[PDB]
Structures are given as C-alpha cells and as structure tokens.
C-alpha cells in the first residue's frame, strides 16, 4: 500500500514510520514545510504506526535526538517513538479489510489528518490545539502533551489489569479530539477501509 506523508506545518518535522520491530520503508525522513514523502508499506502489515518528531538534531550518520517522538536517536526509526506522539495507526489486509485510527494514548505532539486516497471509507482527524490547552501536569518540557499513563505510571491510567475507565486526563483528550483513542479501553474510533487502500497522513491539516 502507498502512504503519502505531507508536512503542512510551518515548522520542519521528522516523519517516522515503523511496525515496532522494523522500519516501514526508509523508517524516517526530514520534512520541511510543504514537503511530501511517499512510502510503500507491504500488504498484510499489522500494527504499523506513523508519527512526527519535532526539534531533531542528527549528524552525517543519521544519529541524534528529537524533543518529541525520538526512536532511540535514529533518523530512520526501527522502533516506536518516545511520547508525546500523536499516532496514525494501521493494520492492512486483515481478512480483506484495512483498519486505521488516530490515537492520543501516547499523548499528542502535532495535529494530524489520516485519510484514504482511494474510495470506500472516511478519514479521521485530531487537529485541535491540544498542546496549548494541555493540563499543567501533562505538559512535556520538550513540547507536546503527555498521556497520563506516561506521566503517572498507574494501573488505572495504563489499563494494566485490562479493567480501567475514562479519567479526567483521558476526557481532556477526548473532548478536544473525539475521533481519536483517548485511553486503552476507549470506545473504538477505528475506521474500516477496503483491503489494499492507499492513504495520506497530513501533519497540521488546518494550519
């Protein structure tokens, strides 16, 4: 499947794409304001994620640090990024269907739109100013708004027992972005698409 990753932000982001144990395509790339990056994701990819990283510094060998979403100091991500990261999540060709969602479970750093470029389903978006409105305890110094599990490490926030409820913190993410997952047991906002669809991930879709 093809994913076009577009940076509509006025600032540079470092896009990342991974399935957790491996990079998706190149795994990462710098995207200046307006740049697009087209990637190929193998059919049958389960648990794929796309996210943006902000304020990165990399050397000539692709080793450095990012203030948000850093994946162990690499330009080309093989693993998932450090929170806060707004996440585009997908599982492709799962019994003839594609499953897409936007998640705030690992916090928020950049607004995003995740839409199909082919027919058969609607897109999802989380474009609210979550960073500006972020509760004081969830504010990440490097920028972004952390989820409560990352900050507090409790059974309730992390849904460790598989029995958790919404919280004051998850309600905040849900209020600003109803179409994104706000906690592990949130009522799914997953979108079902025909198998082998193509997509566009847009960072800062409005501004």
UniProtKB/Swiss-Prot annotation:
Keywords: Cytoplasmic vesicle, Disulfide bond, Signal, Taste-modifying protein. Its main location: cytoplasm. It is found in: Cytoplasmic vesicle. Coiled coil: none annotated. Disulfide bonds join 9-204, 56-66, 71-77, 121-193, 126-177, 134-145, 149-158, 159-164. GO terms for cellular component: cytoplasmic vesicle. CDD domains: TLP-P (cd09217). It comes from the Eukaryota. It holds the Pfam family Thaumatin. InterPro entries: Osmotin/thaumatin-like_sf, Thaumatin, Thaumatin_CS. Taste-modifying protein; intensely sweet-tasting. It is 100000 times sweeter than sucrose on a molar basis. Belongs to the thaumatin family. This is Thaumatin I. It comes from Thaumatococcus daniellii.
């Amino acid at each position: 499947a093809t994913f076009e990753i577009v940076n509509r932000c006025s600032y540079t982001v470092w896009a990342a794409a991974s399935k957790g144990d491996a990079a998706l395509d190149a795994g990462g790339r710098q995207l200046n304001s307006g740049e697009s990056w087209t990637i190929n994701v193998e059919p049958g990819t389960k648990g794929g994620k796309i996210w943006a990283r902000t304020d990165c510094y990399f050397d000539d060998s692709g080793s450095g640090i990012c203030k948000t979403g850093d994946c162990g100091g690499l330009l080309r991500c093989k693993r998932f990024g450090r929170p806060p990261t707004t996440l585009a999540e997908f599982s492709l060709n799962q019994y003839g269907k594609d499953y897409i969602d936007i998640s705030n479970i690992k916090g928020f750093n950049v607004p995003m739109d995740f839409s199909p470029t082919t027919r058969g389903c609607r897109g999802v978006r989380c474009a609210a100013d979550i960073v500006g409105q972020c509760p004081a305890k969830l504010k990440a110094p490097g920028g972004g708004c952390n989820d409560a599990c990352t900050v507090f490490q409790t059974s309730e926030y992390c849904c460790t027992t598989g029995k958790c409820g919404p919280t004051e913190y998850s309600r905040f993410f849900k209020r600003l972005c109803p179409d994104a997952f706000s906690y592990v047991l949130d009522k799914p906002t997953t979108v079902t698409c025909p198998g082998s669809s193509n997509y566009r991930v847009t960072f800062c879709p409005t501004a």
